[PDB]
């Protein structure tokens, strides 16, 4: 139930201007990445609650349950958005219920909980600018001296994860430039932690199998996690996964929890987007670009039965325990928007 069936575009553009503004920046990739999508999402919803007129909570539920369905229609693949929404919905119904009970002291109006919801929203914001700090701590309970680590594609969360341990313990790391998309960032990361005193070895995205023979652990930072524990990761990460499984090398994932979403991977072909082929073939080979089929996937998928351990802003947990976070973080009704 999108918002267009509840409010008109002009009204949406008038009362909730930043929404349509964000919707524009969403489908146009003006905003991008999971983190930047999340923070901007809540900031929008903050103003929404800060500038809305309503009475019942049930009608307030129907509103946010509508913009999200529209907001998620923009660029659904960046699930980071919808995850923030369903969090708010439960954050309302349980805040309502917890306040529906104090009023039932002995009475046997019902709104303007505004600033609390805002104060509840800000609690989500301040929680995000922190996941790295909350995650980079559990490193010292896994990475040890002289260990050998493999990791692909400039995941910021993974960067501060290792750099923390590298402050005190000294060890080695192999970095595979997540070609083609994560090329630039990956080299920077390698250059960065190189200064952090950790043996860094940049490789082609293809020499994965060659070195997996003598690799202790492998570490990955995803783009999103789906209801079955599957991972929607950036380009070219199933190789290292399958390379690890073939070598009995364990697979660990260091990701914030906001990237977790209960959407179920019915059809992956509707998930893995495709970017421009410019990233892999120049415009110049005019003969080729006219004679062949060029494709450049942005994301990669790995199934959960290949992950051995997750690293979250809450703690380390096996994939089979992931669901019990969702029910403790989301509500079942808000699976489909």
């Amino acid at each position: 139930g999108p918002i267009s069936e509840f409010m008109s575009t002009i009204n949406v553009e008038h009362t909730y201007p930043a929404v349509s503004s964000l919707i524009a920046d969403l489908k146009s990739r003006k905003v991008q990445g999971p983190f930047a999508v999340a923070v901007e999402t809540a900031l929008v919803m903050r103003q929404v609650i800060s500038q809305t007129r309503w009475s019942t909570v049930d009608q307030l539920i129907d509103t946010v349950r509508a913009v999200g369905s529209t907001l998620v229609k923009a660029q659904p693949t960046e699930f980071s958005c919808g995850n923030i929404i369903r969090r708010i919905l439960r954050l309302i119904r349980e805040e309502y219920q917890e306040l529906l009970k104090t009023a039932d002291e002995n009475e046997k109006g019902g709104m303007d909980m505004r600033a609390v919801i805002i104060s509840g929203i800000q609690d989500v914001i301040d929680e995000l600018d922190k996941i790295n700090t909350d995650i980079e701590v559990q490193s010292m309970d896994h990475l040890h001296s002289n260990e050998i680590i493999l990791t692909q594609g400039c995941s910021k969360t993974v960067e501060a994860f290792l750099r923390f341990a590298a402050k005190k313990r000294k060890f080695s790391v192999i970095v595979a430039e997540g070609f083609p998309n994560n090329q630039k960032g990956s080299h920077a990361m390698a250059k960065r932690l190189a200064q952090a005193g950790i043996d860094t070895t940049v490789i082609s995205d293809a020499t994965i199998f060659a070195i997996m023979s003598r690799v202790n652990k492998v570490i990955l930072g995803t783009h999103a996690i789906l209801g079955n524990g599957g991972l929607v990761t950036y380009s070219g990460a199933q190789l290292v996964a399958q390379a690890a499984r073939h070598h009995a090398t364990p697979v660990v994932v260091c990701s914030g929890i906001y990237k977790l979403s209960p959407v179920y991977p019915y059809d992956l072909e509707s998930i893995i987007q495709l970017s421009s082929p410019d990233k892999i073939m120049s415009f110049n080979e005019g003969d080729l670009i006219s004679r062949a089929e060029i494709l450049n996937p942005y994301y990669d998928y790995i199934p959960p039965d290949l992950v051995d351990l997750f690293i979250t802003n809450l703690g380390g947990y096996p994939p089979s325990y992931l669901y019990r976070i969702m029910n403790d973080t989301y509500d079942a009704s808000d699976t489909i928007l």
Binding site: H142, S145, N146, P250, L309, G316, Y317, P318, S320, R324
Partner: protein, 363 residues
């Protein structure tokens, strides 16, 4: 002590040996002991370092009913109240009580629980008030979490035993012994396989116990596993602790037992108690472990160190040659088919939820 120095060497002990980090340091004597230490702790402390066949579960008990006496004999100074100082007293006990032998998980979790209830009691209650409930809180913690859960497991474990089985244990797990012992009294028809290993043959005492109940048993060392597993039909395992991923944490050969059972299609039943569970998570059996002195390997024959002039007896003074012996390894869940806790037969991977079923009970 030497303080940061002896606390910097530890973080210098991080080099080539994959065991560079495993803390070898011990205190097997009461020499130079501090005075902040209750006697009954010392006896317990000497028990840990010197007892060998002891303490899959008996430690937590023997630690708690010892702790009562500590607090019982304790009295707060006139200045500060009780809760403002008790922990520091107990903190000075465990520090000693570590250098005798590192903490188990069963002990460590109980300590983590005791320090909590200390911090949550109300100040109105006086000493003789404050003490009396703790013992009950402890005596309950013993009966609720340990003994009862045992009797629940023993019942539930004996349930899935079938007349005609041939079941295999490994190195005297007081829990699994209680199962087979209970199994005989109900009249279940079966027979047991006992796998022992070096060094301190912890398995022969299980043979003694079982035989003193008239049980068809079979004693073979671990290196003969490939042989005897064909006979076996079920495998029972009592663990030191289970892991958040669902991995079973027990003594050295606990993995190979589960392994060949899988490759011989027999089940691996893990009898463990709920409080032994831990939010800890580890992948390789070397990150977190506990060492036994390698000198015990010098014993060539079939007895504890006695008339054993092993050709290794000088390994401490032979370069490039150093013995060792872990006493704990990490067996992954793919081999464990089921864990039986007092919450019932659960899949091993379902552990960390049960832990979360406690932080709800505790605020």
């Amino acid at each position: 002590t030497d303080a940061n120095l002896q606390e910097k060497k530890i973080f210098e002990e991080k080099q080539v040996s994959i065991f560079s980090h495993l803390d070898w340091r011990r205190r097997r004597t009461t020499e130079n002991i501090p005075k902040d230490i209750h006697p009954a702790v010392i006896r317990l402390g000497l028990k840990l370092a010197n007892y060998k066949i002891f303490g899959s579960n008996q430690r937590c008990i023997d630690l708690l009913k010892t702790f009562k006496i500590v607090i019982q004999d304790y009295q707060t100074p006139y200045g500060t109240t009780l809760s403002r100082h008790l922990t520091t007293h107990i903190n000075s006990q465990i520090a000693y009580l570590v250098s005798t032998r590192p903490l188990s998980i069963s002990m460590g979790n109980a300590i983590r629980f005791l320090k909590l209830e200390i911090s949550v009691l109300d100040i109105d209650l006086t000493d003789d008030e404050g003490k009396e409930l703790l013992l009950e809180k402890i005596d309950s913690y013993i009966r609720d979490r340990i003994i009862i859960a045992g009797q629940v497991i023993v019942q539930a474990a004996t349930e899935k035993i079938q007349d005609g089985d041939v079941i295999l244990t490994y190195l005297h797990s007081s829990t699994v012994n209680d199962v087979l012992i209970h199994a005989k009294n109900v009249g279940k028809k079966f027979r047991v396989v006992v796998v022992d290993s070096r060094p301190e043959f912890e398995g022969r005492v299980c043979l003694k116990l079982l035989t003193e109940h008239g049980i068809e048993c079979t004693y073979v060392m671990i290196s003969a596993l490939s042989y005897i597993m064909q006979e076996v039909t079920k495998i029972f395992l009592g663990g030191h602790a289970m892991l958040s991923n669902g991995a079973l944490y027990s003594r050295a050969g606990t993995s190979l037992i589960s392994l060949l059972g899988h490759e011989s299609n027999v089940p691996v039943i893990a009898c463990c108690e709920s409080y032994k569970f831990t939010e800890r998570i580890q992948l390789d059996s070397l990150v977190y472990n506990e060492l036994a002195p390698g000198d015990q390997l010098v014993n060539m024959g079939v007895d504890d160190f006695e008339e054993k002039p092993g050709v290794l007896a000088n390994w401490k003074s032979v370069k490039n040659l150093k013995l060792l012996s872990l006493k704990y390894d990490v067996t992954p869940p793919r081999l464990i088919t089921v864990c039986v806790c007092e919450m019932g037969l659960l899949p091993s991977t379902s552990v960390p939820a049960i832990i979360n079923e406690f932080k709800q009970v505790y605020a």
